[PDB]
């Protein structure tokens, strides 16, 4: 139990952070430059 | 709704319960026993066969004028151990080469496995057929025991190579074809040991055995041994010389005596006596 | 005057190469023992090499850390077929671990593979390109194939690369660690290759099923079909024809933008000999068969999006006039639509040579066949399917440490997911009108 | 070529081994005299996996026997195929374990383990590239759990590179055999979770229960219980010894059989096990196989496989067959078990294809899986531990040989946490 | 008890001896037939039809 | 007759082929290599060789023995002269022979 929470806590810290990047890594290869 | 494993149980003959289930398992053995019977692998068919051939008919050749000569199928008896030397082909000794153990047996009924052959070991000046003391000769097994010619042989002392029971130099029934085959008779009476050289050997007279490559006497001692053919004693080579010392050193310098004539008594346990068949 | 060195990494790649080798040898008359029986001709140089003594050594390299895969080949009848040391044999398998196949045990073996490849290219002077098959959901294939993908780009540079990868089956798969090794291989393999191909197993399953009615197909038939495709692309490379296409003409006809280099190919017709008697097998009719979803060789429905590119190769007794006519038939159908900005994407070549059927095969003897390789945004879902799985089992850090202990960086996982989202949208933005 | 070693000790440990080698020889074709008389060609290309090479007269099985008393050893030698083991690996003490763990790990084992460590390393360095270690021992036995685990403990320190499996036999509450089964086992389970890579347990109660239910044998003998496992255990390495379509090694299992680092406890079942009832009346086909392999009463564990959720499961299919069924069979089974399969880690089933069939059978299935139910055994033992410890029953002769109650306190906390840690993931929802 | 040694061999193999008969607890009319066959051992060389494989008989 | 085989040449040829096998696999093996090759081709399984397999058996493991030289070795190996040889004995001389 002592080592349970610390291992689970950090991952959730990163895991939530990890899901943050994926929307943030969104570059649509010159979205409007095709027509622009 | 039938129930199984109902406490006390009968034999499968009755059909009280679980009868058929055990029956097939019971019935299977013969079927499995059938196929193992289909190919020759049964132990019972194995144990007996060894006795048959080994106990195959053997006829020791006659002796004329008590002059045992090379070729006459003779036996080797232990005079003190009251037994005849017996050979085995099945059991395998812990030897990389192909050598087989030996056993001395009390029973004196004649069997092939207890018969050997005395074929001239080496061409020599003695072209006349009567064997002479100190004329090289070899122990040969009967052609019936094994397909390949088998020769009895012994090697030297070794911490790694030693007798299984006696702890002395072992005697080996192998197929080697070197020095290790020779032997030479020697008269039992210690005094006559010198002037017997070249003399005829007479059947029925006690015979000792010594190894020319190593000079050790082949004798038997009261030590048990285990093999299929009942219980038996062991065979090995050694010198049971009378432990009492003889001051041979002063004999030479003073010169009263020579090394050739032995001054050390040799006990009976080495006693062997060649014997021929009862009738011609 | 064109030679191609083939690359196969992992046991699955070795199996596929083995299966394609029998057909390749047969289509050229070279006996299994390495001597062509006494009889464009004898110009086997395209796939094999001649000392001048009679032998025919293939220009292929087999790599594996698992001895089981190549122990058999060295034990088979063809034992004389392949160069003895040309099949580097590993000791311990990567055990499906991407890092182990990429970070711990792959380094000490990589040099050996590079040396052999360097040696082989010396004989050839007009090498068209390199052919590589690897398992994205397979450990040893991913890393060993991946690393070579990095080196070749720096060993030679501008030299093109054609990758034929086998992504994990969409619904029924064997391995469970595939989502990791797939993303990492997808993360890395992306920027070291020229084009890709879809090779999911279920598609070959159902193609063999509804076509051959084989309720019990195995991997040998899948490899047979794969090889048949492999014979397709190069066919114009070693067969005379009015319309010929070479490897160098791939980035010009199948790449709208450099990043998008993932293509899905289909082959047909696949018909049992018991059903071809009542079939005309016309060139035009087979044209339709290659465009509807069920005949696709990947578990994908092209109807979910437009079409960006499509390359058709023809070989047999076809005529060019029918090709435009039947193709003209396809443009009529409203069920297949391209993107707003791709007016011409058809690339058609004609090769007189017919397909060769190896003894004991499943496909019957036919006169006309076509290979379909189209660039369509329909690849959007496949990565997303992996995208959902990759997140679900990682958010709890399941199986996390088995990777880390081999040196794999913890943040490296973050980037891998970073790219997969980026690649998904790139197909997205190219699906809107002006 | 990546061979494993075998170190069997204790009254239970050696008895299991006696059967396994016999099974291995029969499959691999080596007579009692140690000479090879196999039939197939592929059986002479890998004998190194479980047999060495020596003078032209025999192949020496790399075996070691460890135990504190001579009586148990004396039986193995007289058993059939007892000529196989080389004498040099024979180590035996004269004191006897007495079912006391402390005596088995602290006092006596210290001055006998030195030689066994000596022999093991000598055997250890003989290999080219060792593949792993697989120790058979009994936690409830006095000689094994203490002496046996320590051999394991040293191995981990000295070779952190190789992997290790564990076939341990744990006592179940319904069947009671040793009055010290609770304690001695408890001290044992402590040193495996921190040191063992793969652990698959076997319960005596099942092995009896499978026999009379499936086999329905009236009076099966120990040979039956031992005999089944020996073939079963050799089923794990089938892909590791002969050719196969989808080669799969234990490490592949380790990576593909362990969800979290402290979740390496396994239970196994074997199929198709068919009783003498209808051998010729049944058809052995893949649909029959998968149906039996998920039977809750076929596994070698006492824990109910329907009171939890399945984490990971793998079977190294045996014999020639088409993949479609294998992919179709599991996928057919997997979706139909939406209640008993975890979700956050999808595709929780593996498959393998090693063509070689075991003798007399065409379809053979060997099963391993990490199931949440295993803790159900832990409750029974632990609950026993607390009851029998509160009164210091028999403790004073687990303390009089040089160990104090502190570690007892430490250990008992270990199981409870280990059980709890394995239950929270039961309710874990993404 | 005379206990002829011949019966011991016969009695043990019929009367629930504490052993097992050569891996016959995993048996399945006549079955030794040590079978073995791999893909490339037979398929690619022997040219055995893909459907021919399996085919229990 | 052109000439007669000389013993020393017998010593070299036996030696020459002998050292040839040591170039195979590991030192621990190289007796199974002689045993295992035999097992592959022997229908009788009794253990009786002939000339052809011997010339052949030498053929497999790179042993180009000349016909007249071929005959010299065979006789020297066998005191039976019956046209047969024991494999275990035949192997024994090749490796298990302390004396030249
Ligand atoms: N369709 C098809 N797939 C195959 C075949 N052989 C192997 N595979 C693929 O192999 C996967 C199983 O893992 P492997 O490919 O054996 O693992 P790997 O690629 O060798 O990677 P390592 O773990 O490092 O050995 C499956 O998902 C298949 O996609 C084949 O013959 N046909
Ligand atoms: N299934 C099975 N269990 C056994 C066998 N031998 C011993 N056991 C178990 O081992 C336990 C006692 O082990 P023990 O005698 O202390 O082992 P030791 O320490 O090595 O002497 C008993 O509860 C048995 O259930 C066997 O042959 N089969
Ligand atoms: Mg692999």
Asked if F96's CB is within 8 angstroms of B175's CB, the reply is: no
Q: Are C235 and C353 in contact (CB under 8 A)?
A: yes
Q: How far apart are CA C250 and CA C160, in angstroms?
A: 9
φ, ψ dihedrals at C408, nearest 5°: -60, 130
**D239 contact partners, CB below 8 Å, separation of at least 6:** C68, D246, D247, D248, D249, D316, D352, D353, D354
Is the CB of residue D189 below 6 angstroms from any atom belonging to ligand 2? no
Domain with CATH 3.40.50.1440 in chain D: 3-256
* Residue C45 tokens, joined: 């140089």
Q: Is the CB of C369 under 6 A from ligand 1?
A: no
The beta-carbon neighbor of C67 closest among D1, D252, D325 is D1
Are B131 and B137 contacting, i.e. CB atoms less than 8 angstroms apart? yes
Chains B and E touch (3+ CB pairs under 8 A): yes
The one catalytic residue among C72, C92, C191, C249: C249
Pairing of strands C48-49, C57-58: antiparallel
- Interface size B-E, in CB pairs within 8 Å, comes to 13
**How far apart (Å, rounded) are the C-alpha atoms in residues E5 and E2?**
9
Q: Which residues, in sequence order, are bridge partners of residue D163?
A: D132
Tell me what percent of chain E is helix, strand and coil, each rounded to the nearest 5.
30, 0, 70
Largest Cα–Cα separation, chain D: 63
Burial class (CB in 10 A: 0-12, 13-18, 19+), D327: buried
8 Å CB contact between B211 and B142: no
Cβ contact D56–F28 (<8 Å): no
- Name the minimum distance, in Å, from the CA of C225 to any CA of chain E: 13
Apex CA D274: angle with CA D269 and CA D276, to 5°? 145
Q: Which domains does chain C have, with CATH numbers?
A: 3-262 (3.40.50.1440), 263-381 (3.30.1330.20)
Which residue, by CA, sits nearest to atom 14 of ligand 1? C138
Interface of B with E in 27-56 (CB under 8 A): 28-29, 32-33, 35, 43-44
Q: In the 8-state DSSP scheme, what is residue D374? A: G
Name residue, tokens 């049964």.
Answer: B42
CA D270 distance to own-chain centroid: 13
Instruction: Give the Cβ contact number of residue D398 at 10 Å.
Output: 21
Which protein residue has the closest C-alpha to ligand 2 atom 4?
D12
Cα of D6 from ligand 2 centre, angstroms: 19
D382: enclosing H helix or E strand: helix D375-390
Name beta bridge partners: B269. none
**Interface residue D56 vs chain F (CB under 8 A):** yes
Q: Is D3-256 assigned to CATH 1.20.140.10?
A: no
D388 to each of B275, D384, D392, D415, how far by Cα in Å?
Answer: 81, 6, 7, 15
Compute, in angstroms, the gap from residue D246 CA to the centroid of ligand 1.
7
Q: Which ligand 2 atom is at minimum distance from the Cα of D137?
A: 20
CA distance D366 to E34: 19
Residue D306 structure tokens: 């329907």
B-C interface (Cβ pairs under 8 Å ≥ 3) = no
Cα C175 to Cα D341: distance, rounded to the nearest angstrom: 16
Q: Is the CB of C139 under 6 A from ligand 1?
A: yes
| Superfamily, domain D265-374 | Tubulin/FtsZ, C-terminal domain (3.30.1330.20)
Contact call for E18 and D221, based on CB within 8 A:
yes
Q: What letter would DSSP give residue E41?
A: I
What Cα–Cα distance (Å) separates residue D341 from each residue in C200, C387, D261, D338? 25, 21, 20, 6
Contact yes or no for C58/C394 (Cβ under 8 A):
no
Question: Angle at which helices D110-126 and D149-158 pack, to 10 degrees?
Answer: 50
From chain A residues 1-30, the ones with a CB under 8 A of any chain D CB are: 1, 4
Contact D255 C11 (CB under 8 A): no
DSSP string, D140-153: TSHHIIIIIHHHHH
SS (HEC) of chain C? CCCCEEEEEHHHHHHHHHHHHHHHHHCCCCCCCCCCCCCCCCCHHHCEECCCCCCCEECEEEEECCHHHHHHHHHCHHHHCCCCCCEEECCCCCCCCCCHHHHHCCHHHHHHHHHHHHHHHHHCCCCCCEEEEEECCCHHHHHHHHHHHHHHHHHCCCCCCEEEEECCCCCCCCCCCHHHHHHHHHHHHHHHCCEEECCCHHHHHHHHHHHHCCCCCCHHHHHHHHHHHHHHHHHCCCCCCCCCCCCCCCCCCCCCCCCCCEEEEEEECCCECCCCCCCCCCHHHHHHHCCCHHHCCCCCCHHHCCCCEEEEEEEECCCHHHHHHHHHHHHHCCCCCCCCCCCCCEEEEEECCCCCCCCCCCECCCCEEEEEEEECHHHHHHHHHHHHHHHHHHCCCCCHHHHHCCCCCHHHHHHHHHHHHHHHHHHHHCCCCC
- CA nearest neighbour of D200 among D90, D301, D294: D301
**Which residue is closest to D322 within chain C, CA to CA?**
C218
**Residue B238: how many other CB atoms lie within 10 Å:** 17
Chain F partners (3+ C-beta pairs within 8 A)? B, D
Closest by Cβ to B44, choosing from E6, E30, E32: E6
In this structure, what token pair is assigned to residue B149? Answer: 């010619």
**Distance in angstroms (rounded) separating the CA atoms of residues D249 and D238:** 9
Residues of chain D with CATH 3.30.1330.20: 265-374
Q: Whose CA is nearest to atom 10 of ligand 2?
A: D12
Q: Cβ contact (<8 Å) for C220 and E44?
A: yes
Q: Which of E6, E9, E21 shows the shortest C-beta gap to B32?
A: E21
With tokens 């076997």, the residue in question is D202
Query: Using CA atoms, how far apart are residues D302 and B39, in angstroms rounded to an integer?
Result: 43
Using a CB-CB cut-off of 8 Å, the residues of chain E touching B32 are 21, 24
Of C349, C352, C371, which is closest to residue C230 (Cα–Cα)? C371
Distance (angstroms) between ligand 3 centre and the Cα of C66 equals 6
Q: How far is the CA of D270 from the centre of ligand 2 (A)?
A: 22
Which of these, C10, C167, C222, E43, lies nearest to D246 by C-alpha position? C10
Tell me which residue has its CA closest to atom 5 in ligand 1.
C12
CA distance A27 to chain C (A): 6
- The two tokens of residue B110 are 């004649």
Q: How far is the CA of C95 from the centre of ligand 3 (A)?
A: 7
Q: State how far residue D339 is from chain B, nearest Cα, in angstroms.
A: 33
D226 annotated to a ligand binding site: yes
What resolution in angstroms, rounded to 1 decimal? 4.1
Query: E strand or H helix at F16, and its extent?
Result: helix F7-21
F91·D55 Cβ contact <8 A: no
B145 and B129 Cβ atoms separated by less than 8 Å: no
Those of residues 29-48 in D touching chain C at CB distance below 8 A are: 45
**For residue C413, which residues of chain A lie inside 8 Å, CB to CB?**
18
Residue D89 · residue D134 · CB < 8 Å: no
Beta carbons of D74 and D15 less than 8 angstroms apart: no
Task: Name chain A contacts of C419, Cβ cutoff 8 Å.
Answer: 25
Question: Does residue C94 line the site of ligand 1, with CB under 6 A?
Answer: yes
Q: Is C424 a catalytic residue?
A: no
Residues 6+ apart with CB under 8 A from A3: none
């Amino acid at each position: 139990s002592q080592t349970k929470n610390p291992f689970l806590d950090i991952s959730k810290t990163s895991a939530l952070l990890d899901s943050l990047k994926s929307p943030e890594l969104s570059q649509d290869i010159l979205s409007k430059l095709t027509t622009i | 709704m039938h129930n199984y494993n109902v406490d006390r149980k009968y034999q499968y003959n009755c059909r009280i319960g679980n009868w058929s289930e055990e029956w097939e398992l019971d019935e299977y053995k013969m079927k499995e026993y059938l196929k193992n019977k289909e190919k020759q692998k049964l132990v019972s068919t194995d144990k007996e066969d060894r006795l048959k051939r080994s106990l195959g008919g053997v006829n020791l050749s006659y002796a004329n004028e008590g002059l045992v000569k090379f070729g006459y199928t003779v036996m080797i008896e232990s005079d003190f151990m009251n037994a005849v030397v017996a050979s085995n082909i099945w059991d395998k000794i812990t030897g990389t080469e192909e050598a087989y153990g030996v056993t001395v047996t009390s029973q004196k009924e004649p069997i092939v496995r207890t018969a050997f052959q005395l074929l001239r070991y080496e061409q020599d000046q003695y072209q006349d057929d009567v064997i002479h003391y100190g004329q090289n000769f070899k122990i040969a097994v009967i052609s019936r025991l094994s397909e390949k010619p088998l020769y009895l042989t012994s090697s030297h002392i070794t911490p790694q190579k030693c007798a299984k029971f006696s702890r002395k130099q072992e005697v080996s029934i192998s197929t080697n074809e070197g020095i290790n085959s020779a032997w030479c008779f020697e008269y039992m009476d210690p005094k006559l040991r010198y002037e017997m050289k070249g003399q005829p050997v007479r059947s029925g007279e006690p015979v000792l055995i010594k190894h020319i490559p190593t000079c050790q006497w082949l004798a038997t001692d009261n030590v048990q041994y285990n093999n299929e053919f009942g219980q038996e004693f062991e065979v090995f080579c050694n010198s049971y010389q009378c432990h009492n010392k003889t001051q041979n050193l002063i004999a030479e310098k003073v010169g009263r005596k020579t090394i050739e004539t032995p001054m050390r008594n040799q006990t009976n346990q080495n006693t062997f006596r060649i014997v021929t068949a009862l009738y011609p | 005057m064109r030679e191609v060195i083939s690359i196969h990494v992992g046991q699955g790649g070795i199996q596929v190469g083995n299966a394609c080798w029998e057909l390749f040898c047969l289509e050229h008359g070279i006996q299994p023992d390495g001597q062509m029986p006494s009889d464009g001709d004898d110009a086997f140089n395209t796939f094999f090499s001649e000392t001048g003594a009679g032998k025919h050594v293939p220009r292929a390299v087999f790599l594996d850390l698992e001895p089981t895969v190549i122990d058999e080949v060295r034990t088979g009848t063809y034992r004389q077929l392949f160069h003895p040391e040309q099949l580097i044999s590993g000791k311990e398998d990567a055990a499906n671990n991407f890092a182990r196949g990429h970070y711990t045990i792959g380094k000490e073996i990589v040099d050996l593979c590079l040396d052999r490849i360097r040696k082989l290219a010396d004989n050839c002077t007009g090498l068209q390109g390199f052919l590589v098959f690897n398992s994205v959901g397979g450990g040893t294939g991913s890393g060993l194939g991946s690393l070579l993908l990095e080196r070749l780009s720096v060993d030679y540079g501008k030299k093109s690369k054609l990758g034929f990868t086998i992504y994990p089956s969409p619904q029924v798969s064997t391995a469970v660690v595939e989502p990791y090794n797939s993303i990492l291989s997808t993360h890395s393999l992306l920027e070291h290759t020229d084009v890709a191909v879809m090779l999911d197993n279920e598609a070959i399953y159902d193609i063999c099923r509804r076509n051959l009615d084989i309720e019990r197909p195995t991997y040998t038939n899948l490899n047979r079909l794969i090889a048949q495709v492999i014979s397709s692309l190069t066919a114009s490379l070693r067969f005379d024809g009015a319309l010929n296409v070479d490897i160098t003409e791939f980035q010009t006809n199948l790449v709208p933008y450099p990043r998008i280099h993932f293509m899905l190919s289909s082959y047909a017709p696949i018909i049992s000999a018991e059903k071809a008697y009542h079939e005309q097998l016309s060139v035009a009719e087979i044209t339709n068969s290659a465009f509807e979803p069920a005949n696709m060789m990947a578990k994908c429905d092209p109807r979910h999006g437009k079409y960006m590119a499509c390359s058709m190769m023809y070989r047999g007794d076809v005529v060019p006039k029918d090709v435009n006519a039947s193709i003209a038939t396809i443009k009529t159908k409203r069920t297949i639509q391209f993107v707003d900005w791709c007016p011409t994407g058809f690339k058609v070549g004609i090769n007189y040579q017919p397909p060769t059927v190896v003894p004991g095969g499943d496909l019957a003897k036919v006169m006309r066949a076509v290979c379909m390789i189209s660039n369509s945004t329909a690849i959007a879902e496949v990565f997303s399917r992996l995208d959902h799985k990759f997140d679900l089992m990682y958010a709890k850090r399941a199986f996390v440490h088995w990777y880390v202990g081999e040196g794999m960086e913890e943040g490296e996982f973050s980037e891998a997911r970073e790219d997969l989202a980026a690649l998904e949208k790139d197909y997205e933005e190219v699906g809107i009108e002006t | 070529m990546r061979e494993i070693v075998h170190i069997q000790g204790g009254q239970c440990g050696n008895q299991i081994g006696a059967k396994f080698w016999e099974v291995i020889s029969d499959e691999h074709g080596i007579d009692p005299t140690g000479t090879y008389h196999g039939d197939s060609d592929l059986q002479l290309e890998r004998i190194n996996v479980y047999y060495n090479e020596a003078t032209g007269g025999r192949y020496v099985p790399r075996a070691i026997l460890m135990d504190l008393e001579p009586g148990t050893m004396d039986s193995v030698r007289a058993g059939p195929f007892g000529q196989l083991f080389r004498p040099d690996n024979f180590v035996f003490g004269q004191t006897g374990a007495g079912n006391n763990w402390a005596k088995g790990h602290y006092t006596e084992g210290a001055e006998l383990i030195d030689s066994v460590l000596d022999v093991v390393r000598k055997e250890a360095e003989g290999c080219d590239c060792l593949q792993g270690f697989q120790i058979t021992h009994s936690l409830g036995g006095g000689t094994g759990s203490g002496m046996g685990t320590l051999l394991i403990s040293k191995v981990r320190e000295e070779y952190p590179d190789r992997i290790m499996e564990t076939f341990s036999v744990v006592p179940s509450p319904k069947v009671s055999d040793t009055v010290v089964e609770p304690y001695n086992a408890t001290l044992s389970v402590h040193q495996l979770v921190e040191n063992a890579d793969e652990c698959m347990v076997i319960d005596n109660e099942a092995l009896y229960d499978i026999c009379f239910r499936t086999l329905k044998l009236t009076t099966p003998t120990y040979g039956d219980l031992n005999h089944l496992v020996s073939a079963a255990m050799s089923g794990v390495t089938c892909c590791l010894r002969f050719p196969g379509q989808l080669n799969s090694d234990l490490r592949k299992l380790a990576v593909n059989l362990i969800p979290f680092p402290r979740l390496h406890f396994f239970m196994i079942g074997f199929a198709p096990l068919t009783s003498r009832g209808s051998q010729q009346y049944r058809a052995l086909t893949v649909p029959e196989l998968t149906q039996q392999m998920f039977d809750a009463k076929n596994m070698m564990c006492a824990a109910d496989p329907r009171h939890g959720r399945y984490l990971t499961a793998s079977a190294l299919f045996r014999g020639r067959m088409s993949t479609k069924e294998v992919d179709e069979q599991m996928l057919n089974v997997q979706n139909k078990n939406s209640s008993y399969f975890v979700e956050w880690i999808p595709n929780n089933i593996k498959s393998s294809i090693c063509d070689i069939p075991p003798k007399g059978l065409k379809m053979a299935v060997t099963f391993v899986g990490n199931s949440t139910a295993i803790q159900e055994m832990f409750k029974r033992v632990a609950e026993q531990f607390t009851a029998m410890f509160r009164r210091k029953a028999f403790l004073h002769w687990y303390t009089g040989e040089g160990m104090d109650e502190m570690e007892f306190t430490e250990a008992e906390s270990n199981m409870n946490d280990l059980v709890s840690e394995y239950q929270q993931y039961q309710d874990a929802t993404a | 008890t005379p206990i002829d040694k011949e019966f011991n061999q016969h009695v043990i193999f019929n009367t629930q001896g504490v052993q097992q008969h050569i891996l016959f607890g995993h048996g399945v009319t006549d079955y030794n037939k040590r079978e073995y066959g791999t893909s490339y051992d037979l398929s690619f060389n022997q040219k055995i039809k893909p459907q021919t494989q399996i085919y229990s008989k | 007759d052109d000439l007669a085989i000389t013993k020393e040449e017998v010593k070299g040829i036996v030696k020459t082929i002998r050292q040839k096998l040591i170039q195979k696999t590991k030192g621990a093996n190289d007796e199974f290599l002689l045993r295992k090759l035999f097992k592959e081709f022997d229908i009788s399984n009794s253990g009786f060789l002939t000339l052809d397999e011997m010339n052949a058996m030498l053929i497999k493991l790179e042993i180009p023995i000349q016909k007249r030289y071929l005959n010299a070795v065979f006789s020297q190996l066998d005191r039976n002269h019956s046209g047969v040889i024991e494999f275990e004995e035949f192997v024994y001389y090749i490796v298990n022979d302390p004396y030249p």
